[model samples]
Structures are given as structure tokens and as C-alpha cells.
Target: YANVVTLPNVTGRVIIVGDIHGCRAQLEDLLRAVSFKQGSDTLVAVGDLVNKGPDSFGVVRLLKRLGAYSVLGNHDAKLLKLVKKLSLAPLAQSIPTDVETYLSQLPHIIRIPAHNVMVAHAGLHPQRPVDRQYEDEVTTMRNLIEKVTLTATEETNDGGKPWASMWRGPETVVFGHDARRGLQEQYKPLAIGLDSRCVYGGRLSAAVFPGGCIISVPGWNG
Candidate 1:
């Protein structure tokens, strides 16, 4: 895809987390129930920031000290291709260079056109033009009952059909891998789906953009 990333301006609040498989205390209790502020809040992640719960290195050092940013899902691109085909420089010097440059500049698309918003990490291929999507179908798309323009690494096998039930958005398109349809949205909000399967226990969503507020916090059964 075209690697979009437009924050534009957000002096505070623009959280939006989900699918944080690490579930570091429900991502620190969803940033202390959304009071988050580590330099005027703005953490975005929609990626599987590491495998199933129990401290993926303390939830990536608490979302890299709360200056969080993400969008490289599909189990973070299969753990960065199994840490670069196992060239593991001592597990890459034990991570943390701002969480390896914010997970190596994660960006399959994240357009907060002043909160008319748009994010990725699974979901977007409804007919392409999401900046010409293809970064592994913008991070492993799901359900698409055959509009198939794909080929970049093909994989739409299992009967597709739920691309946000045909997302008809002109803006709103937040996402997070389909955690068994945990927290979905479509008609009445355009499209949203913060994977509410906090490490599979459930509930750990967030979405407080310029206005489109949302919340959830109890999860972390590990």
C-alpha cells in the first residue's frame, strides 16, 4: 500500500488500541481507563503487538513508553519474518530502540483526516485504492467473498464474506484483526472493530478520536 500516516494534529487524546495480544494488563488498564497522557496522549496500535498475553516484553515496554504507534499486524508480520530468518543478533540486541523504531515504522495506512479517521491492521480491500493496498493485503485481510484482485502472496481461501460486511465507508474504518467479531461496527458508524478479544479473554478496546469516543477495559486472564 501507499504507507499513509497522517496524524496532522492531535494535542491530546487519539488513543485507539485493540488486538494487543500481549495484553499487558489490558494495555495498562486501557491506559488507566483513558486518562492516558505521556506527552498529551496519542497511542494507536491495531496490531498483534506480539503473541498471546503474558508480557510481550512488558507489552512492548508499555507501548514504547506511551508514544505508541502501530499497524503491522498479522502477528506483526509473523514476528518480522521470524526475526529476519533467524539472523537474530542476540534476539536483535534485546529490542527497544524505541521498540525497534516503532516496530519498524509500521504503516499500512492510518489516516486520521482530522478524525474522519481510517486505520488498518486487518480490514481494507473492499475494492482497493486504500493507497493501492497490497502490504500483504494491508496486513492479512479477512472475509471477502471474492472481489479478488489479489496476488501479492495470495490467501483468501476459506469462504470469504465479512470485509466489514461490505464496508461502505467514506472515512471511518478503524480495525484490528477479527477477534471472532468481538467488537464490530458497520452500518451505524461506517466501520470499526477494535478486536475485543484481549488476549482471548475479551474486552480491551479503545477508540477516542477527535470525537468518535468508545471504551472498554476488563481483560487479561493470564
Candidate 2:
């Protein structure tokens, strides 16, 4: 229901995690490496918290226990569709009731106003204000192409430029969902791409805020 959630006066460190994709081991490794403390440090995930790897429920449980913040990624959205229909029709992927509660409450965007940062599942539209961008586009965009004129698309090539490249931000946008770009830092201070294809035998990456450091852990090869 809520499109955005804002943490007004956030303090302490904010760990901006990339897509988990059910790789619980790597997530724990990154948490350990960062010396993450549940109450003191805040954990914010770029989403894609389930599917594609081992232990999706384990990852979800850990994040829930830690009270982590996350935006809803496309994979996450798919899970919700099943949850909404579980009572009406049986689905092969039935989940815990609490997990349903957790996922159902996720916002499309999480903003740390004090830090002037926005976390989205996919990159934002460069032409529109943060609040005005469409839910589908923010959750699926990979590039900006000129079809009729200029628009967002999941397709990478078509003479399309990355959406982040065009961002002229006063509020830095941090996002995931484009593993192909793999840890895009060239657009720093405007945008940061954290997806590094962790589910596809690559590194599980994250960006630490209040300090702006990028860190990662090795992911198991598929």
C-alpha cells in the first residue's frame, strides 16, 4: 500500500545490501565482516530477498529477526502475488504466515531523509521526481531508451543508456536489479548500483553509508 517509507532522523551506520537471492551464507559472511549489531547498525537491503539459490526462508527469517529495511524487488513482488492467492488457489510455493506479513508491508522505496538517500529495487527515472516515478518502472528498469521519445525498459541494448547515468541527483539513489552492470560506482554521489550477480556465482556486494564504502563477500558458484 505504501509507496515510500522514510526514516526521518536516522543515526549510526546504514548497511545498504545488494540482492540476497536466498544466499544466506554470503549474507551472514558480509554481516560478520561488517561486525553488524542489530540495534546499533541498520541493515537496508535493495531487495530480491528470495528465490534462485539455497535457503530463501533462512534469509527471510534472519532479515526479519534483525528488523532490516528493504524495498520490494520484482522477485519479491512475484512471491506476493502467490501469497495473495494462496487462500483462493493453491500455489506450489507456500510460505510462512509471518513472511507473508513482512513481504506484504514492504514499500517500493525507502528514504533516509537525513542522509539524502533513496533505496529502490531498480534505478529511478532521471526525468521524474522520486515520488512521481511509476512502481513497475522502478522495480524493473535496466536502461532508458527512446521508443516514442524517452522511456525505461528492462532491455539493456536498443541504443539505450543506463538510467543511473542520466541522474543529476541532490538525493543519491542506491539500487539493485541490474546484475549485468555489476557494482556500478562511476555514477557515485548520484547513484550506486549494488547488484553484482551474487546468485549467478559472483560476489554479494553492499555499500556502507554514513561513510560510503563498498564491501562484498564471495558467493558460491552455480
Instruction: Give each model's whole-structure lDDT.
Output: 0.74, 0.85
Local accuracy of candidate 2 as per-residue lDDT tens digits, 10-82: 8778999999998999999999988898899999999998888787778888999999989999888877886
lDDT of 1 by residue, 61-144 (tens): 777776678778877676666665642344344555556566767877888777687888887776777778777766776666
lDDT of 1: 0.74
Q: How many residue pairs clash per model?
A: 2, 0
Q: TM-scores across all candidates?
A: 0.32, 0.93
TM-score computed on alpha carbons, candidate 2: 0.93
Off-target runs (Cα >4 Å) in candidate 2 are 87-92, 147-149
Q: Model 2 Cα RMSD, Å? A: 2.7
Supply candidate 1's per-residue lDDT for 82: 60
Looking at model 1, report the run of 10 residues with the lowest lDDT sum. Answer: 147-156
